[PDB]
Amino acid sequence: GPKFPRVKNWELGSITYDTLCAQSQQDGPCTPRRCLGSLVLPAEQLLSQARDFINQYYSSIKRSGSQAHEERLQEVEAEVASTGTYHLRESELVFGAKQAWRNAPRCVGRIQWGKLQVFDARDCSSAQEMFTYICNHIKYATNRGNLRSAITVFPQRAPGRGDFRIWNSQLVRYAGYRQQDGSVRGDPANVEITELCIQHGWTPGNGRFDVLPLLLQAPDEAPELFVLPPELVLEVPLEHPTLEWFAALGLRWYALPAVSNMLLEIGGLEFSAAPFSGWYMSTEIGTRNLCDPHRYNILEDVAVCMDLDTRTTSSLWKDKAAVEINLAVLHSFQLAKVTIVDHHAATVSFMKHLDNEQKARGGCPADWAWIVPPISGSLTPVFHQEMVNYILSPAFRYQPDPW
Amino acid sequence: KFPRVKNWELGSITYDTLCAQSQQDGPCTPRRCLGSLVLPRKAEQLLSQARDFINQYYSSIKRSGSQAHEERLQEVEAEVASTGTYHLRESELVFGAKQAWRNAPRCVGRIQWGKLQVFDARDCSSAQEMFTYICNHIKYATNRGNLRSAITVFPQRAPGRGDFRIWNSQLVRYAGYRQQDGSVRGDPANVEITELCIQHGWTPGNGRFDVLPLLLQAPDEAPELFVLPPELVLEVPLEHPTLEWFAALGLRWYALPAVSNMLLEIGGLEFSAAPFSGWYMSTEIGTRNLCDPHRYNILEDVAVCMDLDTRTTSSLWKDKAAVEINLAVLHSFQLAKVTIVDHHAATVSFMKHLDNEQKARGGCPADWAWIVPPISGSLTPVFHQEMVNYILSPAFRYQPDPW
Numbered sequence: 001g002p003k004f005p006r007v008k009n010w011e012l013g014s015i016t017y018d019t020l021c022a023q024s025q026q027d028g029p030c031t032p033r034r035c036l037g038s039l040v041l042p043a044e045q046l047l048s049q050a051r052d053f054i055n056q057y058y059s060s061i062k063r064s065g066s067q068a069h070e071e072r073l074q075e076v077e078a079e080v081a082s083t084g085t086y087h088l089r090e091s092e093l094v095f096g097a098k099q100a101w102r103n104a105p106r107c108v109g110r111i112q113w114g115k116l117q118v119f120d121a122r123d124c125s126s127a128q129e130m131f132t133y134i135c136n137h138i139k140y141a142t143n144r145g146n147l148r149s150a151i152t153v154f155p156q157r158a159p160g161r162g163d164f165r166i167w168n169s170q171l172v173r174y175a176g177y178r179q180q181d182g183s184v185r186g187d188p189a190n191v192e193i194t195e196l197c198i199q200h201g202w203t204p205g206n207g208r209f210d211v212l213p214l215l216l217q218a219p220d221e222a223p224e225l226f227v228l229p230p231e232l233v234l235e236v237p238l239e240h241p242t243l244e245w246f247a248a249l250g251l252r253w254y255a256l257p258a259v260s261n262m263l264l265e266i267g268g269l270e271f272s273a274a275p276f277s278g279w280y281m282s283t284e285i286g287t288r289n290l291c292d293p294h295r296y297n298i299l300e301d302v303a304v305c306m307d308l309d310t311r312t313t314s315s316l317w318k319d320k321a322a323v324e325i326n327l328a329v330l331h332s333f334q335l336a337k338v339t340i341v342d343h344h345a346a347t348v349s350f351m352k353h354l355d356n357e358q359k360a361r362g363g364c365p366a367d368w369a370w371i372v373p374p375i376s377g378s379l380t381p382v383f384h385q386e387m388v389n390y391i392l393s394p395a396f397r398y399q400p401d402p403w
Numbered sequence: 404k405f406p407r408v409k410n411w412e413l414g415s416i417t418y419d420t421l422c423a424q425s426q427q428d429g430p431c432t433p434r435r436c437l438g439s440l441v442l443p444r445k446a447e448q449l450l451s452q453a454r455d456f457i458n459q460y461y462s463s464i465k466r467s468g469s470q471a472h473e474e475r476l477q478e479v480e481a482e483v484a485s486t487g488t489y490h491l492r493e494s495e496l497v498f499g500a501k502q503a504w505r506n507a508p509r510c511v512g513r514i515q516w517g518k519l520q521v522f523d524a525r526d527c528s529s530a531q532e533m534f535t536y537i538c539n540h541i542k543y544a545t546n547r548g549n550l551r552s553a554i555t556v557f558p559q560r561a562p563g564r565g566d567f568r569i570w571n572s573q574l575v576r577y578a579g580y581r582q583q584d585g586s587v588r589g590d591p592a593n594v595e596i597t598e599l600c601i602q603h604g605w606t607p608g609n610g611r612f613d614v615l616p617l618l619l620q621a622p623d624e625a626p627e628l629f630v631l632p633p634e635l636v637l638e639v640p641l642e643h644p645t646l647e648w649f650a651a652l653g654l655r656w657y658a659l660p661a662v663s664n665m666l667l668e669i670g671g672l673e674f675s676a677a678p679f680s681g682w683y684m685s686t687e688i689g690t691r692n693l694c695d696p697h698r699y700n701i702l703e704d705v706a707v708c709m710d711l712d713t714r715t716t717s718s719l720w721k722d723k724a725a726v727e728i729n730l731a732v733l734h735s736f737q738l739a740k741v742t743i744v745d746h747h748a749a750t751v752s753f754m755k756h757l758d759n760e761q762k763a764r765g766g767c768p769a770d771w772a773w774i775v776p777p778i779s780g781s782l783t784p785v786f787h788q789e790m791v792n793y794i795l796s797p798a799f800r801y802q803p804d805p806w
């Protein structure tokens with residue numbers, strides 16, 4: 001066959017050849033000797049990255065080689081020459097931002113990539129203004145439960161000058177209080193960050209679901225702390241359809257999944273503060289956040305209520321419970337009329353996504369372990385899809401925690 | 404150079420130093436990760452792969468440098484020098500067999516790698532004799548239901564001649580009969596193989612669980628059809644603790660998972676027929692075999708007996724039903740007194756295996772996407788554990804289909 005990787009679907013029996021990977025300008029962790037695919041974390045150089053993105057842009061508008069294409073090129077090196085950086089045009093930001101989401105090997109919601117609201121915030125001057133900008137994002141994106149994908153782009157990393165940073169990892173997060181015995185009250189994922197807000201004068205609450213304040217950082221200034229108006233932070237009380245007691249557990253989650261600690265890289269430019277929001281997939285809440293032994297860990301609690309034999313694994317008690325918990329998440333979101341998507345619908349649309357991208361780009365970089373859901377793995381069609389994972393740009397990046 | 408493997412549940416960290424002993428290549432390159440591909444589209448070497456294997460053995464029994472070691476190495480040099488190949492001593496073979504399993508990155512059951520009965524069938528000359536071995540291996544491994552891991556090793560490949568092969572992928576397989584309706588009564592995975600048997604003379608039944616005969620091949624001979632005496636094959640009808648209608652589904656599965664299509668490499672000699680068997684981990688039966696859309700596919704049926712809401716995905720009927728089916732399997736096997744391990748027990752013992760091998764060898768190759776079971780991934784400790792994949796020798800390979 002062809003000299004690009006072959007890509008079977010073992011359910012349908014279909015084949016495809018990924019030609020997109022040939023565009024990757026970035027090494028990953030794997031080598032012919034060993035595969036590190038399962039690891040979570042893995043000047044002139046600018047000019048040529050910049051040139052690259054511009055060609056992408058111009059091709060995306062079908063003008064590859066034309067007078068405006070080669071003038072914008074002339075223009076970009078003119079800027080770099082005399083300053084070391086350069087700036088994106090309004091629509092260039094829009095394209096590159098969409099291109100980063102499109103390129104994200106670990107997101108399963110990519111079928112939605114074309115529809116995303118790019119909120120330009122490169123005019124932002126202070127931590128106060130950051131907050132305001134953000135409050136607007138949450139309001140738009142949340143849209144009273146009929147959610148809408150968006151990203152707010154704050155300004156970009158500069159030579160020897162501070163970064164714009166959101167200290168929190170998500171915009172909405174529950175507190176995590178280290179107890180004087182050893183336990184954690186709240187979300188254990190958010191211990192450190194809780195511990196940092198108090199250190200910067202936050203008065204902590206008491207409960208399993210205390211919404212955290214925002215730690216925003218303007219360049220060179222210390223981080224300023226900001227409390228989200230409660231009316232802004234839409235939450236969903238959880239309850240089971242048929243199990244009447246579930247509602248009494250006092251469990252809950254928030255509507256807006258919005259990542260705030262990732263780096264948005266476009267054509268060499270680095271946007272250190274550019275939080276994006278979508279909507280949740282049922283399992284993120286119900287299988288990861290609530291049942292991970294290192295998170296809310298509510299599996300044993302709920303199985304006791306369901307009255308299952310937890311003295312032995314053969315009872316598949318863990319399984320059973322997880323399913324009801326997931327279902328409680330779905331029903332409860334649907335009932336409160338807030339956008340959500342179960343793992344079956346989500347994966348079925350990712351299949352359509354992969355088919356769409358084959359036609360258009362000749363490939364789609366996918367992180368299999370990440371695309372396949374944390375329950376009911378082989379029941380979703382993606383589990384039977386072989387997947388190439390490589391790094392394309394524009395991209396999102398992990399970046400060091402600022403403190 | 405040496406990779407940092409993390410567990411995210413516990414925050415614990417290791418470094419893998421074992422991967423440096425890998426001499427073979429994998430699919431990944433630094434440009435793109437192919438870890439998810441199921442299979443790989445892929446006088447002097449033998450001398451060095453032997454020396455280095457023989458080295459392992461003597462090092463493994465503490466006599467590394469001794470009389471017997473020195474003198475065995477010269478046995479090999481002399482045997483390859485005159486014959487272009489050499490032969491293994493039975494102990495040496497027993498060692499290799501145990502090791503190749505130990506190295507199988509996609510095997511979750513490797514906690515047991517030390518406990519393996521090894522049948523030396525290297526003095527086989529007829530498909531007749533093969534069938535006696537195969538029959539005897541089964542009678543041993545099954546043990547009235549108290550299963551015991553085994554491998555039986557037919558003659559090594561040789562350059563002047565064709566291989567000893569078993570045509571079946573497993574020693575026990577249900578026939579999949581094709582039908583005018585574009586339908587498949589029986590197991591869809593065994594359609595091609597059922598048709599071969601027919602072509603080769605066997606009378607077919609027309610049940611959903613018709614145990615297939617064996618097609619055995621001595622070098623350069625036409626394959627031959629041997630039937631397994633019904634009694635040797637242990638089956639388990641499936642019932643369900645709570646639900647009485649389940650058994651009336653007439654579902655059933657066989658006790659012994661025994662792979663017969665793979666090749667065993669040791670000291671660079673190739674063992675083309677070398678079946679091996681252990682015991683089932685329940686998900687293989689209740690999830691993949693019984694619910695794969697391209698297999699027996701009972702998910703809809705079952706669910707409809709359960710009177711669930713098939714009409715939409717968000718009722719989580721696919722998951723709900725999957726679980727009952729997995730549960731049905733465990734109960735049935737525990738009831739019929741037949742070795743089985745559920746995904747919870749197993750992955751736990753594998754986490755122990757990782758730890759044992761960590762101290763013993765400084766690592767352990769593992770294929771994350773095959774170790775994490777096909778339901779309730781995140782609910783098993785493996786999900787949260789980083790894993791390095793690489794090719795250690797002795798090893799099982801895939802090989803072409805003989806026909």
Ligand code: HEM
Binds near residue numbers: 104110
């Ligand atoms: C529209 C609804 C969306 C859904 C249902 C969705 C789904 C998901 C899920 C389930 C994950 C795995 C996260 C985890 O389990 O830890 C993920 C990862 C990711 N998604 Fe989305 N996503 C959506 C929207 C978005 C949007 C709007 C963006 C960017 C604007 C985005 C970019 C990403 C990125 C960069 C990752 C990988 C981040 C990481 O490495 O932690 N997704 N997606």
Ligand code: HEM
Binds near residue numbers: 553
């Ligand atoms: C003893 C109890 C055992 C258990 C519970 C077990 C479990 C498993 C499971 C669940 C798989 C995944 C295969 C799939 O779902 O398609 C697997 C793969 C594998 N196991 Fe085991 N195993 C056991 C014993 C053995 C033995 C005795 C051997 C060899 C002597 C072995 C070697 C392998 C190999 C080579 C694979 C890869 C299969 C392939 O690539 O097609 N295991 N094991």
Ligand SMILES: Cc1cc(N)nc(CCc2cc(N)cc(CCc3cc(C)cc(N)n3)c2)c1
Binds near residue numbers: 259278281284398
């Ligand atoms: C701190 C940290 C570092 C790291 N390397 N990995 C993790 C776990 C993965 C993860 C990380 C973040 N920051 C956000 C999500 C929500 C995922 C999400 C985002 C969007 C936009 C929509 C959606 N449905 N889900 C998931 C955390």
Ligand SMILES: Cc1cc(N)nc(CCc2cc(N)cc(CCc3cc(C)cc(N)n3)c2)c1
Binds near residue numbers: 661679683684
């Ligand atoms: C035909 C074929 C080719 C190919 N490349 N891949 C597959 C799927 C993987 C598979 C193949 C076979 N032959 C047997 C099992 C049972 C796995 C098993 C083995 C043992 C020894 C114990 C156990 N519990 N489970 C799994 C099938």
Ligand SMILES: C[C@H](O)[C@H](O)[C@H]1CNc2nc(N)[nH]c(=O)c2N1
Binds near residue numbers: 384386439773775
């Ligand atoms: C395409 C995908 O990698 C493939 O379906 C894998 C996934 N994980 C698996 N895990 C096991 N144990 N066995 C399998 O056959 C598979 N199939």
Ligand SMILES: C[C@H](O)[C@H](O)[C@H]1CNc2nc(N)[nH]c(=O)c2N1
Binds near residue numbers: 040369411786790
């Ligand atoms: C080690 C392993 O890769 C890790 O546990 C991954 C598995 N898949 C995941 N998938 C998602 N979406 N999020 C995660 O945190 C993880 N964890």
Ligand SMILES: [Zn+2]
Binds near residue numbers: 034431438
């Ligand atoms: Zn890889």
